[PDB]
Amino acid sequence: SSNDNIELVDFQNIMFYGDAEVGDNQQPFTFILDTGSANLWVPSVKCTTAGCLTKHLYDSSKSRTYEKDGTKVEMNYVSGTVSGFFSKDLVTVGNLSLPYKFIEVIDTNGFEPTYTASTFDGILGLGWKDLSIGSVDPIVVELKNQNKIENALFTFYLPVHDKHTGFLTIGGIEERFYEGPLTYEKLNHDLYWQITLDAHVGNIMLEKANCIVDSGTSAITVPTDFLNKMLQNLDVIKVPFLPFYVTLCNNSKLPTFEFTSENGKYTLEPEYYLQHIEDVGPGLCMLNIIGLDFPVPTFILGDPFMRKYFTVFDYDNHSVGIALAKKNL
Amino acid sequence: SSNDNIELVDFQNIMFYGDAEVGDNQQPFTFILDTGSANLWVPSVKCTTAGCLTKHLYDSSKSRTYEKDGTKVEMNYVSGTVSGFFSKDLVTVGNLSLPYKFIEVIDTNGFEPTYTASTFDGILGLGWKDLSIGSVDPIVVELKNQNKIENALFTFYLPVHDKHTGFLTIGGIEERFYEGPLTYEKLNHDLYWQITLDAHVGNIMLEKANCIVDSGTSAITVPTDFLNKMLQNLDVIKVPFLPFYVTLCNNSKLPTFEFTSENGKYTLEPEYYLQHIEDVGPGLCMLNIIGLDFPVPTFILGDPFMRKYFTVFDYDNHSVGIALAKKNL
Ligand SMILES: COC(=O)C[C@H](O)[C@@H](NC(=O)[C@H](C)NC(=O)C[C@H](O)[C@@H](NC(=O)[C@@H](NC(=O)[C@@H](NC(=O)CC(C)C)C(C)C)C(C)C)C(F)(F)F)C(F)(F)F
Ligand SMILES: COC(=O)C[C@H](O)[C@@H](NC(=O)[C@H](C)NC(=O)C[C@H](O)[C@@H](NC(=O)[C@@H](NC(=O)[C@@H](NC(=O)CC(C)C)C(C)C)C(C)C)C(F)(F)F)C(F)(F)F
């Protein structure tokens, strides 16, 4: 130990959260720690909306370090919208802290059913400045420019359901989380953590695909046409009009995703992208895969990928490191 | 015979489609005939997306009546987006015709993976002018102004799978499609075909609910909070990651929707709204009740409702007629 950690807690097989706090009096919250966005928000005590009922709420008045701002903001996600206003106050992650600009959400009705169904309070973005609203410097970037950490990087070791918990480590790389070598891939842009890889599945290939490493996405996301050809004569049922794909867990035709570069080769075998749905039926699984088209052909390497591979997110060197995650700590 | 009858084909009691043409040659197409939108669109031959490759495409230069417009349009739906540009031509629906402004589509990826996985080419909207983009007067309104039909009204008798085909009748009500009395409900706005009903499922009551009668919605759609209360007295299986649920189709505890007004009482039993997934497991079903929040608390009575109830869409009298559909022609 030397860097600062944030324990990640598996939430009943789906998502993982981590705790951080806001205000010089602390005030704990539960966050989706999300490399796929770049704003921090937190539900306000001035929230009037149904979704806030079960949530930890933020009270600026109990904070001596609070600094009013009040500029209105709307925060858009694939899964919904959340509005409020900007504020500034001490944000604390691990036992690192800094004065930080963030959003006090007072309206969450555009974020249902997700927000009421989930136990997170807010979202802590870990992307790049250009992805943000209100041009906020990333937390880890600001910490390094204030010399509170050695390196402007952070690291994800995801929790696995029954096996172990996870860690978001800020400031340095720890050998204990991985096996074999790290391989680094340079970002094609400073926005999401997006790198370029050849994507190969069947005898289907997409050369030079834009791949986004996104901790806040619970699936592997794939281009629509690519997904469509992938499932051609696998024996997988797409329930009509739903992104709901069902197979025998044992289906011997299920392919392995292969993403390659000059530096390395990363695979995702069926065991990493399948979710058991035994309650639905015996020996049944669902593909934790969504079809999604971007302007440029794009995969999101979400949690199923990051469950297999320990990842390093390096702002200084503009790259992502990838290595096999240790099965047990 | 006397009115314009357009045959409807079933897909698995999930959705239905009907054909119509563009240009003075046939150039046939399969549409979602959709009371929940107010635009017509067809995929251009100038569309090269992977979805368009499997569809009937519209060649504007194989038809004398084409009149270019060229203006860009983004058509937005709850379930997806389609982009293209305005054009004008002869739209032939059944045995009637009219010069009509419509969208030639060149980008379909915003509506995938649904588009490619279904058999429709485009969407023919049957809503009101104010719901449209490009302020286009509805086909049926214009068809009445041109005295090609008796009444500015159309009618839906939806097909049911191993039982009968259906019909969209333009111009008048025909006794053969229903039994019992027709009951009229006034529109609360000239936008969607939206009326006001008290919605209750046994103690969960949402009085004066805004109810949209939408032929291009495959579900019953419901306020998120309302769905949560219904789920409280059920014990069904949540599909991981997705807002969908799996039941046995014969689950006796499944809710019967009740919708009352001064004028009448409408119910919808599980046998109408459930989506069978026999190919995943015997007796298995998707709930097919979908949480969806609008600015105003709203229900979408989609195909499940309209398979049970013959419906009448009356522009002249600003209302919706409802009657029990005949079980067989
Ligand atoms: C100016 O506006 C802009 O800067 C960009 C724009 O607003 C853009 N927004 C974004 O790109 C923002 C910043 N980031 C994001 O949208 C990406 C995040 O990782 C997001 N993730 C998501 O919304 C992802 N959703 C999920 O993972 C959810 N899980 C499920 O729905 C299960 C399915 C994926 C099977 C979780 C319960 C959250 C999808 C599949 C990508 C979450 F974590 F929720 F915050 C968007 F709205 F999507 F269009
Ligand atoms: C009032 O003006 C506005 O607010 C316009 C606004 O642009 C609005 N757009 C709309 O309301 C437009 C005009 N109409 C529409 O969106 C309603 C249409 O009936 C539409 N239907 C839908 O979008 C409905 N989609 C469905 O029922 C789909 N089914 C599934 O995805 C399965 C799910 C129900 C689980 C079909 C297979 C396509 C949803 C569930 C409401 C379809 F038919 F696809 F074209 C939207 F984009 F959603 F915000």
Short mmCIF file of C-alpha atoms and ligand atoms in Angstrom, two decimals, chain A residues 241-242, chain B residues 15 32 34 36-38 75-79 111 114 123 131 191-192 214 216-219 221 244 288 290 292 300, ligand 2:
data_model
loop_
_atom_site.label_atom_id
_atom_site.label_comp_id
_atom_site.label_asym_id
_atom_site.label_seq_id
_atom_site.Cartn_x
_atom_site.Cartn_y
_atom_site.Cartn_z
CA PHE A 241 -38.07 -6.67 -30.54
CA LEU A 242 -35.88 -7.13 -27.42
CA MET B 15 -46.77 -6.68 -34.23
CA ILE B 32 -45.83 -0.36 -39.49
CA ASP B 34 -48.82 3.59 -36.73
CA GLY B 36 -48.70 6.90 -32.57
CA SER B 37 -46.79 8.92 -35.18
CA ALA B 38 -47.72 11.22 -38.05
CA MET B 75 -37.55 11.34 -37.36
CA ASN B 76 -37.52 10.51 -33.62
CA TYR B 77 -39.37 7.66 -31.90
CA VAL B 78 -39.27 6.29 -28.34
CA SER B 79 -37.59 3.14 -29.69
CA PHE B 111 -33.28 2.00 -35.24
CA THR B 114 -34.92 -3.93 -34.43
CA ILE B 123 -43.45 3.44 -41.08
CA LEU B 131 -47.44 15.39 -34.03
CA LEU B 191 -51.68 15.08 -31.07
CA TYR B 192 -51.60 11.36 -30.40
CA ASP B 214 -50.80 3.28 -30.52
CA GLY B 216 -47.02 0.65 -33.57
CA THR B 217 -46.35 -0.19 -29.90
CA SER B 218 -45.94 -3.92 -29.19
CA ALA B 219 -46.42 -3.55 -25.42
CA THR B 221 -46.71 0.80 -21.56
CA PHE B 244 -38.19 -7.15 -18.76
CA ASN B 288 -44.70 -7.24 -21.88
CA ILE B 290 -43.14 -1.79 -19.88
CA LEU B 292 -42.13 4.34 -19.51
CA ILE B 300 -49.71 3.35 -24.21
C1 LIG C 2 -45.05 14.77 -29.28
O1 LIG C 2 -44.09 14.83 -30.09
C2 LIG C 2 -43.07 14.26 -29.62
O2 LIG C 2 -42.82 14.22 -28.39
C3 LIG C 2 -42.14 13.61 -30.61
C4 LIG C 2 -40.91 12.96 -29.97
O3 LIG C 2 -39.87 13.05 -30.93
C5 LIG C 2 -41.15 11.50 -29.57
N1 LIG C 2 -41.55 10.76 -30.75
C6 LIG C 2 -42.78 10.03 -30.89
O4 LIG C 2 -43.60 9.99 -29.98
C7 LIG C 2 -43.11 9.47 -32.27
C8 LIG C 2 -43.78 10.53 -33.14
N2 LIG C 2 -43.93 8.28 -32.16
C9 LIG C 2 -43.47 7.10 -31.49
O5 LIG C 2 -42.34 7.04 -30.99
C10 LIG C 2 -44.47 5.98 -31.24
C11 LIG C 2 -44.50 5.08 -32.47
O6 LIG C 2 -45.69 4.33 -32.45
C12 LIG C 2 -43.29 4.15 -32.48
N3 LIG C 2 -43.50 3.22 -31.40
C13 LIG C 2 -42.55 3.12 -30.34
O7 LIG C 2 -41.54 3.80 -30.38
C14 LIG C 2 -42.74 2.03 -29.32
N4 LIG C 2 -41.85 0.99 -29.74
C15 LIG C 2 -42.19 -0.40 -29.73
O8 LIG C 2 -43.28 -0.79 -29.36
C16 LIG C 2 -41.18 -1.37 -30.33
N5 LIG C 2 -41.17 -2.54 -29.48
C17 LIG C 2 -40.05 -2.83 -28.63
O9 LIG C 2 -39.06 -2.12 -28.67
C18 LIG C 2 -40.23 -3.71 -27.41
C19 LIG C 2 -40.48 -2.83 -26.19
C20 LIG C 2 -41.93 -2.36 -26.16
C21 LIG C 2 -40.10 -3.55 -24.91
C22 LIG C 2 -41.52 -1.67 -31.77
C23 LIG C 2 -41.05 -3.05 -32.15
C24 LIG C 2 -40.88 -0.66 -32.70
C25 LIG C 2 -42.46 2.50 -27.90
C26 LIG C 2 -42.56 1.35 -26.90
C27 LIG C 2 -43.42 3.63 -27.52
C28 LIG C 2 -43.08 3.36 -33.75
F1 LIG C 2 -44.14 2.63 -34.03
F2 LIG C 2 -42.03 2.57 -33.57
F3 LIG C 2 -42.85 4.20 -34.73
C29 LIG C 2 -39.91 10.81 -28.99
F4 LIG C 2 -38.99 10.63 -29.92
F5 LIG C 2 -40.19 9.63 -28.47
F6 LIG C 2 -39.42 11.55 -28.02
#
